[PDB]
Structures are given as structure tokens and as C-alpha cells.
Design a binder for this molecule. Structure first.
Ligand SMILES: COC(=O)/C=C/C(=O)N[C@@H](Cc1ccc(O)c(Cl)c1)C(=O)O
Ligand SMILES: [Zn+2]
Length: 257
């Protein structure tokens, strides 16, 4: 199936998923000097105090930390959003080297990694229904640069040994995603898509201006994971990012000057 190798990577996705070449695909390059400051953009509301993490899973493309989304416990509101969006899962994209790994780019700059906190619009009842709507998902994207260690990330790093191969999962309760946020909630926003197949065009992207710093030792542990399942030949899980797609008929708004 689809992946990030020479023969099944993003260049090939359009064959099974023709929407790959569609009107609002993600990620994109964020040209900071073309983004329009929009003073009518309300502040982002991130309410994660009652967040309930359940499990961590290696799905063969990345690892997902999954949350109980059966109630309004961890939600995104405000900013460009109408209504309430519940946190369902977060995961990362990263590189084989510190100089690549992010999906979005800022003035063509690639970051070492990118975090995606995925939320769905409660008005649609469940994640599966939400992805069929143009405003079904809100994804908060955070860049990672390599520098000082992120303490709130270490609990994630430590459990990776236990989910090394595709299909492995582990218990992962009492994790607080607030430890993954930068100081500022200043952001860019644009209409886009899932960055993995089926690449559905259902996402309001909210990309934070300020990256978080993680240590080289922390990202190094991401790179020890495997794309392959247990017993299969070993392919390191690295460079699991889709490159920037054409902006086309879209505008990027900024919450700040
Ligand atoms: C930007 O974030 C994303 O691209 C998030 C992608 C994502 O959450 N994908 C799912 C799989 C999935 C399951 C049911 C469905 O109807 C579809 Cl369309 C996908 C996953 O990784 O578990
Ligand atoms: Zn992602």
C-alpha cells in the first residue's frame, strides 16, 4: 500500500487517491510575507485540562497517541473555527536528518519535525462523518526545532521502545498534551486536507508561528521506529512527511502582525 519509499511515496499517491492533485491539498509553504493579517480572527481557545489519553500505536506510517473523544474533554475553539472540535489523536512527522521532517514549510524552511493535533467538529457526531465535510476537522500544527529538550515530550519518547513495529500498541494514560505547546498561540490558518491518504479535503489548518525545541536525543529516538511489522525486514521510520503542495486558489490568514 502507500508509504514514503521510492516506489510508494507521495509522488505515487495520486494513482490510488486522485484527490492528491485537488483544489485544497496540504501541506503548503507558508510565505510569511503573503499571509494576510486578519484582525477579525478571534483568539484560539485550547482547552485540554480534562484530556484523557488512552493508548499509543505504531500504525506503520507514524505513531498516534489516541484520546477519549466521547465527551467534550479536550477541545479546540475560537480562532477561525465555528463550534467545538474534539481532540481524537496526535502524531508527528520527522526526517532522517535535522534539516528536514516538517510537512508545512515557512518561507521554504523545513523544520526537523511537525506535530499534528487532530480534532473533529462535534456537529458531525463522529470522526468518520467529519472527514466527509469541508469544515469537519481542525488540525493544530506545531513545528519542532532541535535545541534544548522538551520535558513534556519525554514520556512519549520513553514508550517508543515498546511500539517499535507496525501494529504494536501500548497503554498510554495520564498524558497531558499541554506540555507540547509553545508559549505563543499566534498562528496562520488556511483550508486544506489530510496529509496522508485518503487525503480528504476536510481540514481547517491552524499552524503555530512559534516552534517548540526538542533535543537531538529526543528526535533520534523517533528515528529508531520501524515502518515494517514484527519479523519483516527492517525499514527505519524516517522521512514520513508529504512535501509542500500548490497553494492554488487559497489564502493564508495570520492572527498576528
Ligand atoms: C492532518 O491530519 C491527518 O491527515 C489525519 C489523518 C488521520 O487521522 N488518519 C487516520 C485514518 C483514517 C480513519 C478513518 C477515515 O475516514 C479517514 Cl479519512 C482516515 C489515522 O491516522 O488513524
Ligand atoms: Zn500529520
Amino acid at each position: 500500500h502507500w508509504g514514503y519509499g521510492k516506489h510508494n511515496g507521495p509522488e505515487h499517491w495520486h494513482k490510488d487517491f486522485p484527490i492528491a492533485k485537488g483544489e485544497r491539498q496540504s501541506p503548503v509553504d507558508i510565505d510569511t510575507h503573503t499571509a494576510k493579517y486578519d484582525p477579525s480572527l478571534k483568539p484560539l481557545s485550547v482547552s485540554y485540562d480534562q484530556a484523557t489519553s488512552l493508548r499509543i500505536l505504531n500504525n506503520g506510517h507514524a505513531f498516534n497517541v489516541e484520546f477519549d473523544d466521547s465527551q467534550d474533554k479536550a477541545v479546540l475553539k475560537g480562532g477561525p473555527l465555528d463550534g467545538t472540535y474534539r481532540l481524537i489523536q496526535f502524531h508527528f512527522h520527522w526526517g532522517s536528518l535535522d534539516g528536514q521532517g516538517s510537512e508545512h514549510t515557512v518561507d521554504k524552511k523545513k523544520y526537523a519535525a511537525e506535530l499534528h493535533l487532530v480534532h473533529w467538529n462535534t456537529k458531525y457526531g463522529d470522526f468518520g462523518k467529519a472527514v466527509q465535510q469541508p469544515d469537519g476537522l481542525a488540525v493544530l500544527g506545531i513545528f519542532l526545532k532541535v535545541g534544548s529538550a522538551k520535558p513534556g515530550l519525554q514520556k512519549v519518547v520513553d514508550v517508543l521502545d515498546s511500539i517499535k513495529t507496525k501494529g504494536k500498541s501500548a497503554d498510554f494514560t495520564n498524558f497531558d498534551p499541554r506540555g507540547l505547546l509553545p508559549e505563543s498561540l499566534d498562528y496562520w490558518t488556511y483550508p486544506g486536507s489530510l496529509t496522508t491518504p485518503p487525503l480528504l479535503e476536510c481540514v481547517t489548518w491552524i499552524v503555530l508561528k512559534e516552534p517548540i525545541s526538542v533535543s537531538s536525543e529526543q528526535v533520534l529516538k523517533f528515528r529508531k521506529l520501524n515502518f515494517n511489522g514484527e519479523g519483516e525486514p527492517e525499514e527505519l521510520m524516517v522521512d514520513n512527511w508529504r512535501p509542500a503542495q500548490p497553494l492554488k486558489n487559497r489564502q493564508i490568514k495570520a492572527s498576528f502582525k
